[PDB]
Design a protein around this ligand. Sequence first.
Ligand SMILES: Cc1ncc(COP(=O)(O)O)c(C=O)c1O
Ligand SMILES: Cc1ncc(COP(=O)(O)O)c(C=O)c1O
Lengths: 380, 359
Amino acid sequence: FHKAINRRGTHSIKWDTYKNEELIHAWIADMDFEVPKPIQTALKQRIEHPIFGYTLPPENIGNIICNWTKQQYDWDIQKEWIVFSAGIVPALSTSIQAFTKENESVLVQPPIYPPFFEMVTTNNRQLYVSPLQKQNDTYVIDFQHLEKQFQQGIKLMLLCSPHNPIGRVWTKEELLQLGSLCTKYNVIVVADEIHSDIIYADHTHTPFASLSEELAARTITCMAPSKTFNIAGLQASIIIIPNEKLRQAFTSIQYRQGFHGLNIFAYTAMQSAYTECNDWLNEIRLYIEDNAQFAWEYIKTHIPALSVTKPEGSFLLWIDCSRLKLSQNERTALLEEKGKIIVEPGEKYGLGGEEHIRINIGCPRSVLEEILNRLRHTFS
Amino acid sequence: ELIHAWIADMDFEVPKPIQTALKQRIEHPIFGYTLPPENIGNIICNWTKQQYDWDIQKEWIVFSAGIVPALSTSIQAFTKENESVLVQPPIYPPFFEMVTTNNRQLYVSPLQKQNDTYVIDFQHLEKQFQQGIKLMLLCSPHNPIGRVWTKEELLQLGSLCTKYNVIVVADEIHSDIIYADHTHTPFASLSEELAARTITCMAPSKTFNIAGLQASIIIIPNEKLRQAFTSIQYRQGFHGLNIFAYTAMQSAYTECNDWLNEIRLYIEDNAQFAWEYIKTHIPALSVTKPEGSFLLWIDCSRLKLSQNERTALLEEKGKIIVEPGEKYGLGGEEHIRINIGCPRSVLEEILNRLRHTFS
Ligand SMILES: Cc1ncc(COP(=O)(O)O)c(C=O)c1O
Ligand SMILES: Cc1ncc(COP(=O)(O)O)c(C=O)c1O
């Protein structure tokens, strides 16, 4: 992970959307790390059988996924709970159409990954928010506010765990308190756990559906190798739905939308990601966590005008620019014109995103060093 | 062992340039979020000119991860719940499924078998249109009968769609496998008026045996129809194609013209061979003469077997599973479809097993 690899001219959204060669790109959430070599090998092998017609899932894929949830989170699942989706944003949309009617209520907790909002409002459901509470280097759930929203008749809650963009890995105690509110008010939960496998040394990912049979009965769990293994462009996702009635409604929507399984390389890459890549995974968790610690230290020492939220997992870094007292336009201009860095503006993540930025730390230390140098320069 | 003649794809190796472009992309060992290839609009514009003499704009092109999703998106974009969608059986069963699973009303205008071909019944179709059809699904070339519609047939269809204000989804997935005596005419190519009411679904999937990579192109000249379609895609969470769909598409539509010319000759020779073999050795069957694709539609009605007796006889006595016709709707009863997109040796084996089955 130490050596920079050129992504210019690979049709990378991150690196090939802006033509200006002096810009460094740390916005969209993929990594400037090479994929594990066993995934490259598995792909090379499949290309050596030069027919690419309709394919079913590999015969062992269910067992591979069952062993993955058991190994990673000590979660025992059934093969029949597994549904595929070509990405997690489609699974959010499928869930909204499956478990709510038009003008019924869906709750999210900003600041949040923007398709959480967009998929609710574009499907003509009513959007409710329970904004997270900034507290120190971190964020908590305001359970009193959330309960007040649940009392208004919420059908569905989209949970982000770990939460993009702030990097919170929810504790077992936080998820149980959430779980008891979902039971109390009979709320169905979509648990977007796409960030579940990049977790820092002092934290543990608890699948919400793993806490009890009661919570398994009411939860749609969204996972993937996309973020973990930098294969998002292959569109491989896994939806785990323990409740046969919820699973039948979900797969009904997929069916009426003409969905009939993943592309060939999604299955090939997922098969390798979840069997042959454990060492690469251990090493990238250590590398990314050290990157997060270096970034927090660098900003604390050299850009005291900024406040960092300490991430507990994933490779995204959430930064409060409040005390610079800049307009979004003025701050973006400085970053682009003076910094020459492209980072995510926080205002797109809804309430709590005002005057924040999100920088991608899923890159070699030497690149992160340059990003942080340019960030210091930008606000000097 | 069992031959699987029901499969929807060819048993031929992908053209080498597609294998080469794939191997080349895997040299760059990052598989993150990706843009369509920069030149892709120009490559597609050039394809539709090279192949069909059809002039398109770049702005008309939308991507879809398959044609059945494009059928579903079109039904959701252009009709409301409880509005009527028309198909022409016998037809690819997903044509029906995408209407009924979306709570639209199914109408049918069954095609009429004549000699060893089929025609549209324009008198019947017009009577269905008079009942207020919103959307028609046109299959061109038509699976499973292999009809390549003539410009004159499409123009007669077009006058009706103009007269009753019917929006057309043209499923043109089989558009590149056309036999020597025929030409594919995209319905949207016929005039500005018909371009303005048509969604055209094309793909390299069937042509180049890369259906597993899920690359499709949807061409929507009418800006308001195009925006309605992409709005459905957006609310379903679709962004674009997977990396290898783009890689394989770029190459299929630029570097494989000699492979395509050659496959067209081989499949038509297979079609002619199958035709003669069945005429000579199995006179209990009648066969529709295909003009395109790699599917053969066989009438088994003179044998007077139930679907179950026929299917059993084929699997037991023939060690072959075919596509059964009944699920294709009216005109599919006591028919089978067999895939002839295979090496001649496989097809000769397939035909021996049919002859032995219905001996
Ligand atoms: C929380 C969350 N959900 C879903 C997604 C979508 O991922 P994909 O496009 O790989 O399915 C992302 C990607 O950034 C994400 O961070
Ligand atoms: C007419 C027609 N449309 C569509 C398809 C396949 O659609 P998709 O691209 O969703 O696999 C086929 C393949 O059998 C076909 O014959």
